[model samples]
Target: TYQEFTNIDQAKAWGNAQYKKYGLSKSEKEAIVSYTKSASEINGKLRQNKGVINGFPSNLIKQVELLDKSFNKMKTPENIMLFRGDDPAYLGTEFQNTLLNSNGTINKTAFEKAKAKFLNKDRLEYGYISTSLMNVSQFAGRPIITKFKVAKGSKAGYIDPISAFAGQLNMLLPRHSTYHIDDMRLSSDGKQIIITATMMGT
Candidate 1:
């Protein structure tokens, strides 16, 4: 885990520092800034409409995907752990019901509990699920910790926006990615609910 930048300026400088060192091209660097700029700018608006709003920028998604394509140039290993903090208000009942029982606690079965395995797994993970380079504890709702297995020569898992942009250690999962739950329970202090999962195929 790593610390998050308090501002965009520091994030931008961090991105610049990686230009030659990380082999990011000029356009890729620009895309990093462009996407981050619009993302931070439009976050509140997107939240207001629950991400159903549109007509803010042109070619933004393409640029974001461009940054994703460049992630292959990064020097990180094939597999790594990532963290995401979620807002329960936006999570809806689907995810809550899947991971929690009627009383709103982890829905672990006896077999899974005794064997330390997850018997029920979702087919496809959905939504933005923005993540950090390190463990994140305070993003408004519950925390989802993920271990992603990105086999060498694959292009389908998570993307490192931090390294690409030199901004905060903010990473993102491609929508509808494949994953499975490993465990779910309250934090040690019971102040928060924590879900740990292993994402397959990055």
Candidate 2:
């Protein structure tokens, strides 16, 4: 359960077995695979004319539907942190520029002020932020960690359906979710940049 998947099928089979605890329908389980596959296919090509292929949006919508079903069943919501990695040269730098002020510190006031402007409007969108229910260090990229201040029973976070097969804890958020950065600094040894942010639920 702690090893890398050699193939998607093996991972799906293993994950589906574990997903039984959640009682996901057959179509719901397949939606996770479809959504993940579609996401991977277009990860680094979002800007190109043809980067998003047919079926990609549909897959995401299907998974989003599945997410809602499971999320409503959660007994409670608590403030929790999730992690993700991004390319230092691209999204990493962009986040730093957007969230940091000229003085090199988190501009939380500026962020809160601009909240509505930053929200994504796509109904078919999906985000892949992960929790550490498993070793998320394996996510492996610029460390962009986030804390979701979920209200008592808000639909801001849920255990991602893909975790069983992906072998990591991905906390699913509602569509159009956004965040505010809190910190960006070098690691103790100065070899890595760790980002910390608070989720501004959609």
Candidate 3:
């Protein structure tokens, strides 16, 4: 969403530069430029909001496709769930009631229960973070309840999404702006809980 270019020329320049790094064929490179051919053309260029790009020159894409296909094939009733509001999920009254009791001590048991609840634990394995910006804030910021003391003995509630969503980027991006929740899991002490989110570019 942060990608808002002021001009078409700059947009194409960025696209072409990125494409060049991929070792694409002359024709393939041309294909990207031709397809993105117009002002604000990256997405707007999608005629009728449609377009396709095949041949990524790698199997990693297909690997996930088949994995996801198998997931859908299972598609059991319990395999599906109504997961929403991860960002607000933790911030919501239900979750906050457990973690944020500024007037009094936090409900320890409720805090753990809220982690399972916030993460849609009933269906999927491990966490099911949306990764979408709207939901990423749930666990990606500066300690959800530091009053517990963000110390070695701490547990329960988020230390925020930054702890999990690629720490450097988390700290870097926020200097400019935003919220988005992430994961929930056991804390280091194994006596409490926390979360782990990942980001990669290599």
Candidate 4:
């Protein structure tokens, strides 16, 4: 049977019902009662903070919307390729000096050396650069955009609980919160999503 509770008394009532129907053992019943008490305490604290934290409701709604948008755009491939420096055109320009030299013809040995250097440098830069390109391409339709609004409070006086919670949450859920949302945008048709997030904090 289904069970529900509002207050501790209601929780006790449900626990008793479970005991009657399933014949829960003494330890099982005690554990259930203990959990019910703990749940009540947590609920009480939440209720006490309800409305006292002026910005939480709006902020929580924004956070949930951002989460929804993030999951929605997870695997779609509508992204753009803004800069592909590794391409022939860009690479030719990058190594123009080595490839062309002063004579303006393809210098095979110099080109080989340039190629080696390019590959070495790419081994370090490619993963990050390609990932950024892929992200832009995948979300091209959404076009992750951002605008900054200055926080009015003085840095010395302001204590930011949300920022603190974000840091702690990142440490606890290292994967999910690794990138934290700073802002979000919706496409014109509402079928695409763009998120502006930061991996580091100031």
| Pairs that clash in candidate 2 | none
lDDT of each: 0.48, 0.45, 0.29, 0.28
Query: Residues 1-202, candidate 1, lDDT per residue (tens digit)?
Result: 3233445465445534543456667776677656555654444454444444245456655664565666666433334455566533323444443544556444445223422443346545433335654553344345333434334333322233434443345655443456676665556644455565666643
Q: Record all residue pairs in model 1 with backbone atoms less than 3 Å apart, i.e. clashing.
A: 1-134, 11-167, 14-166, 15-166, 157-202
**Sort by lDDT, best first: what order?**
1, 2, 3, 4
Global Cα RMSD, each model:
8.0, 9.5, 17.3, 23.5
User: What TM-score does prediction 4 earn?
Assistant: 0.18
Candidate 1 — worst ten consecutive residues by lDDT sum? 150-159
For each candidate in turn, the TM-score is 0.54, 0.52, 0.24, 0.18
Candidate 4, which segments miss by more than 4 Å at Cα? 1-96, 102-105, 118-122, 126-202
Of models 3 and 4, which has the larger TM-score?
Answer: 3
Compared with the true structure, what per-residue lDDT tens digits does model 4 show for residues 1-202? 1111234444334323322443324443343233223433433343455423334566343432332232221221212111111212333456544444355334456445544544323111111111211222332332222221212120110001112221111000011112233433343544322334333212
- Alpha-carbon lDDT of model 2: 0.45
Clashes found in each candidate (C-alpha, N, C closer than 3 A): 5, 0, 16, 5
Name the weakest run of 10 consecutive residues (lDDT summed) in model 3.
169-178
**What lDDT, from 0 to 1, does candidate 3 have?**
0.29
